[PDB]
Amino acid sequence: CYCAGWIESRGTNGAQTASNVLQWLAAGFSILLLMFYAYQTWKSTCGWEEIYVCAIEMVKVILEFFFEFKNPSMLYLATGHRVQWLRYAEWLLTCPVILIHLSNLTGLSNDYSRRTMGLLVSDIGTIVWGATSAMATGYVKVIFFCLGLCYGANTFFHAAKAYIEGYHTVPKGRCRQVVTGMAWLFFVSWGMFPILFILGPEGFGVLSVYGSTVGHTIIDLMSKNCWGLLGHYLRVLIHEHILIHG
Amino acid sequence: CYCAGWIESRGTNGAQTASNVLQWLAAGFSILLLMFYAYQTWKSTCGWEEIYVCAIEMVKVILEFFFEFKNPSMLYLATGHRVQWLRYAEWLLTCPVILIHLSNLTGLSNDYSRRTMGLLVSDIGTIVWGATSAMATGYVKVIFFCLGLCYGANTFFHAAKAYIEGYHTVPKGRCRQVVTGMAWLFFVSWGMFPILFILGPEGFGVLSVYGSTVGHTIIDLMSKNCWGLLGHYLRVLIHEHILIHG
Ligand SMILES: *C/C=C(C)/C=C/C=C(C)/C=C/C1=C(C)CCCC1(C)C
Numbered sequence: 130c131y132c133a134g135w136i137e138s139r140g141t142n143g144a145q146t147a148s149n150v151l152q153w154l155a156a157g158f159s160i161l162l163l164m165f166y167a168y169q170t171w172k173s174t175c176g177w178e179e180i181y182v183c184a185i186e187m188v189k190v191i192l193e194f195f196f197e198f199k200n201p202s203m204l205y206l207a208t209g210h211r212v213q214w215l216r217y218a219e220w221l222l223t224c225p226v227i228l229i230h231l232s233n234l235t236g237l238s239n240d241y242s243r244r245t246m247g248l249l250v251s252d253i254g255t256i257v258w259g260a261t262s263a264m265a266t267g268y269v270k271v272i273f274f275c276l277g278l279c280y281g282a283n284t285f286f287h288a289a290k291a292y293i294e295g296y297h298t299v300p301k302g303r304c305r306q307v308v309t310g311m312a313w314l315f316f317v318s319w320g321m322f323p324i325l326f327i328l329g330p331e332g333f334g335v336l337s338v339y340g341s342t343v344g345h346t347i348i349d350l351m352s353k354n355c356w357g358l359l360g361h362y363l364r365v366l367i368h369e370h371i372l373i374h375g
Numbered sequence: 376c377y378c379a380g381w382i383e384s385r386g387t388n389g390a391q392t393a394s395n396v397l398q399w400l401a402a403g404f405s406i407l408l409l410m411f412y413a414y415q416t417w418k419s420t421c422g423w424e425e426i427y428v429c430a431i432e433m434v435k436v437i438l439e440f441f442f443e444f445k446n447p448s449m450l451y452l453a454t455g456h457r458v459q460w461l462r463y464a465e466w467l468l469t470c471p472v473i474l475i476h477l478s479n480l481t482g483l484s485n486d487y488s489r490r491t492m493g494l495l496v497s498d499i500g501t502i503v504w505g506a507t508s509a510m511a512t513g514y515v516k517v518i519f520f521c522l523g524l525c526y527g528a529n530t531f532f533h534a535a536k537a538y539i540e541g542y543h544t545v546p547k548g549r550c551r552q553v554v555t556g557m558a559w560l561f562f563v564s565w566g567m568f569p570i571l572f573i574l575g576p577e578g579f580g581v582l583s584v585y586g587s588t589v590g591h592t593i594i595d596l597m598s599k600n601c602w603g604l605l606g607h608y609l610r611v612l613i614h615e616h617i618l619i620h621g
């Protein structure tokens with residue numbers, strides 16, 4: 130199995146160092162966030178979504194530090210394209226949970242809706258089409274990324290509706306400011322993901338594997354750790370509001 | 376890109392013919408079921424889950440007839456293992472929808488529960504771990520299939536609870552017989568999927584690609600088309616019951 134496209138070049142040895150440093154920072158932040166979440170579950174009210182997302186993020190960060198360019202992290206393919214399977218597998222593991230957190234922003238509604246199902250189905254579909262585009266090479270790559278773009282447009286529309294509903298269901302004041310911050314983080318990072326797909330080796334190679342890893346680590350820290358911590362803060366605020374007035 | 380494991384042998388030219396015949400039958404059944412579902416939506420009450428699952432099944436069947444051993448259907452991998460990405464992508468597209476149908480067996484509850492989220496998260500996780508095991512080769516394959524086994528055990532437990540709840544929420548008589556039939560189909564086919572994974576090239580090679588395709592086509596016709604048609608019949612019975620007594 131020679132396939133000279135498998136060697137290519139992973140980075141510039143500076144993007145590699147930046148990726149390693151960002152992986153260490155992401156692992157440290159995930160460890161600290163998991164410790165804080167455990168402390169909360171022991172003392173305060175904490176949701177399962179933030180803990181699960183942070184745990185998967187920590188596992189993915191460790192696996193990307195150690196075996197990023199190995200199998201179940203990098204499929205090498207007869208087409209000469211190295212597919213970062215770890216990235217898309219972690220997306221499939223976390224993004225549905227992130228959207229289950231987006232629905233029920235205030236951790237009180239034990240019920241859900243058909244809009245949550247639409248969100249989840251569209252998100253799984255867009256991740257599937259993006260992974261297929263990453264493995265696709267050629268016009269099939271363009272077709273599958275356009276399919277993922279349509280599914281992600283549906284996902285973004287449903288997420289925006291969920292964010293408006295959450296903004297209008299939280300108490301007036303700090304709670305809706307936190308909802309606005311969560312919406313900003315969500316949309317900026319989730320829109321940067323397809324941009325990095327386009328700029329990465331999976332699309333037009335502009336970023337290289339290590340530069341794409343740097344950018345994806347930044348927007349994962351934004352969309353998984355920071356967004357989850359903001360959601361936990363929102364739920365803490367909701368609990369305190371219920372204790373005082375509710 | 377030579378990697379002599381990519382050639383191997385797809386089948387015995389009899390398993391190939393059986394696979395082609397079963398793909399034609401599955402495509403015909405999916406087309407007829409989609410026509411019937413469109414007729415129902417125009418006249419009767421029909422759910423989106425059955426239509427979506429049947430449409431994805433039809434698309435997957437056509438893509439497996441035409442490009443099964445091509446890219447976005449077969450990742451060839453530097454490890455020499457041909458990964459049927461089409462299979463796992465279709466699982467990711469359909470199984471969450473099949474479980475969204477399993478929750479809300481009677482298409483009346485516009486709300487959902489945290490058990491539905493547990494079902495969906497466990498199902499996505501088990502599909503992810505199974506795909507990773509298929510791409511994994513070696514002891515990593517065993518580890519990831521055991522992780523998928525744990526996630527699928529959680530999925531099966533939640534599905535059994537959902538089936539008991541559905542059995543006890545449908546009217547006594549034909550409705551619960553249909554629920555029992557759906558449970559039998561669901562558990563038999565969904566348990567045959569890991570068995571075929573073990574028996575297929577992705578595990579212990581016993582079945583070959585074409586024999587695995589034959590078995591997977593049979594259990595997809597069981598779990599996607601037949602189960603969805605049974606769910607549609609259950610919802611029709613619920614609607615008629617509400618019209619008479621409800
Ligand atoms: C922690 C990881 C997250 C939140 C990943 C989110 C991923 C997306 C919003 C994916 C978007 C894509 C498209 C809309 C089109 C191009 C392909 C994708 C998969 C990158």
Ligand SMILES: *C/C=C(C)/C=C/C=C(C)/C=C/C1=C(C)CCCC1(C)C
Nearest residue numbers: 501505523524527565568569572598
């Ligand atoms: C239409 C396709 C369906 C319903 C597929 C269902 C898939 C499963 C129940 C998957 C099961 C797996 C495990 C429990 C362990 C071994 C790996 C898998 C992914 C085959």
